[model samples]
Target chain A: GRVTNQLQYLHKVVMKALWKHQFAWPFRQPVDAVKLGLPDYHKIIKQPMDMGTIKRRLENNYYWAASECMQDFNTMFTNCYIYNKPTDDIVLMAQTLEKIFLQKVASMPQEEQE
Target chain B: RVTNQLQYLHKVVMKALWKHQFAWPFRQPVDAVKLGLPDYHKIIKQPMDMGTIKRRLENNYYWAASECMQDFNTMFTNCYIYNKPTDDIVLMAQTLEKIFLQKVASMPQE
Candidate 1:
């Protein structure tokens, strides 16, 4: 249980670091997409984009939420390992969580694409 | 102990599988040395001549057993995160056995 708490703390630290690195992109984008580009054709069809607001939301929603979830699972595994109480079910759950972690690492959002 | 048994079973199965896959070359003289070349030849004499059985054994015995007995204590510490069982020396022995299993997996027997 104590190890789980340590893992939770470590997870928060890692998530915050990832968020600071990953979520600062949209904020740095130009406010006006049309002026930077050559297209105003979609101005009427599409809603105006606020890059700063979009960046904030991305940081708050996607990055923070995903990091928190990953941390929670890490905490669970750490607790199980530390306490020596991990049943087969817990190990299976940990394996499932590992799959998600692997997927997330592979499918991370491309900073340049944004 | 049950888990240790399961781990041992897994190790034996993997070892048998690897040995069956690799040891055929010793029995066969097809001399496809260039085709299925393993890493040991680089250490022994080259040009592929059968000089002597003693020479062959002499050349390859050291090769066979060169990396067999690894530093068991170092490996146990490096891998296998033993929790509260860290105080148990038997658990450390088990952990070393697991490391040996890993090494056997990576070991080249050709």
Candidate 2:
């Protein structure tokens, strides 16, 4: 029952984080996309940011977010009063869940992008 | 080994939550999309229920539900404690195994 609680807790945290990050972008223009095209526009607009640079920036942001989320999750489970040595079964289960989420999001219709 | 265990645990939790929440929506009338049409038949039939107004209210409700889910998730992780700080990692490992049952019930096929 105790372990079940921890897992449940972990699941909620990640999902919440994803939802928060997923909708952070504006509907009119995605920050990442705008940042990517800034460089080309710089020629005409005087201060365009390169699309490649913007893309990289967004990628870095996602990487960091993923890393941080993972780190916090681990700390919660390990550093807290309940220090559980992770098992292969748990890792596999988590990976499975991650894949399932990614697949669903990818499959969502374009109108549901927001 | 300790670090790896923690990392593994984090991965499991995130994935489990993702899987659990993915299938929450149904394929019905898509109430979420009902708000845009003011002169539409559905809104006319249900009069006093203008599509724009209904849509706006439903959208707001959806937004709040989305927001609250995150706040509670964080609170639970940062506040709960039913275990000793020095518990053997192996013992905790057992706890990790038990979460698998939840994974089974909570798992959603893409």
Candidate 3:
């Protein structure tokens, strides 16, 4: 049960954080995996700022927000966490989730891209 | 195409959740694949917007097992149902609900 709890914890943490960020869409391709975007707070990942700024960003960049937030979270953890850097699972899960989302994106109808 | 994505989610996301849910606690599914294990991606062959979101909801159950929090589950489920979230947003909202509220069912009420 203990292991289950921790396992559960890991799964949800990665999943939850992404969810918290609205699972910002248009996940980056592997080519851009290491390519970091600028700290655009008006993206999936918000900076500590006014609610207005954060809310507007979410509305404006819905497609790219989740993708960017993942990028920023990596940067955030690498700097803030005492351990510095997310675990391998976190990295791997992001890749997996990205793959899934990308698959979903590819499957969308052309008109739906509107 | 949506069905293809749904199968992809179930295979890649949900099956992975149940397979390692015991103690795996965060090994990326890719790495796990590297170890020669398999996932539902191959186990299932069928896979849709309300189709997409509904499929995601089905996957949501594995994470629900992670916490067993009824209130959180209720809130999570409703967020998607009542809010008119899009396919993508529905995906995240449900995931966030699982992560944030997984344990909500266990807290001692005052």
DockQ of each model against the real complex? Answer: 0.02, 0.05, 0.02
- The window of 10 residues in a row where model 3 chain A has the poorest summed lDDT is A77-86
Give TM per candidate. 0.23, 0.19, 0.21
1 against 3, candidate with superior lDDT: 1
| Positional deviation of residue B77's Cα in model 1 after best superposition, in angstroms | 14
Q: lDDT (0-100) at residue A63 of candidate 3?
A: 27
CAPRI class assigned to model 1: incorrect
For residue B97, give model 2's deviation from the true position in Å.
4.6
lDDT tens string, model 2, B1-110? 12322232234433443244221221113242464544334322222111232233334432332222222222222222222333342243324323432332232221
Q: Which tens-of-lDDT digit does each residue in A1-114 have in candidate 1?
A: 122332333244433343344333322333344664636424322323322433343444433333334333333333333333334353444334333333333223212111
Could you say which candidate leads in TM-score? 1
Cα lDDT of model 3 by residue, A58-88, tens digit: 4454323233323333323211111112233
Error of 1 at B48 (Å): 37
Preferred candidate (lDDT higher): 1 or 2? 1
What candidate 3 gets wrong by more than 4 Å, as runs, is A1-53, A58-114, B20-110
What lDDT would each prediction earn against the true structure?
0.32, 0.30, 0.32
Model 3 residue pairs with clashes:
A24-A66, A44-A65, B2-B48, B3-B47, B3-B48, B11-B41, B48-B51, B48-B52, B49-B52
Model 3 error, position A56 (Å): 3.5
Give per-residue CA lDDT, model 1, range B15-104, as digits (tens): 443244232322223243665646333422222211221233334422322221222222222222332433353343343343333333
lDDT measured at residue A4 in model 3 versus the true structure, 0 to 100: 31
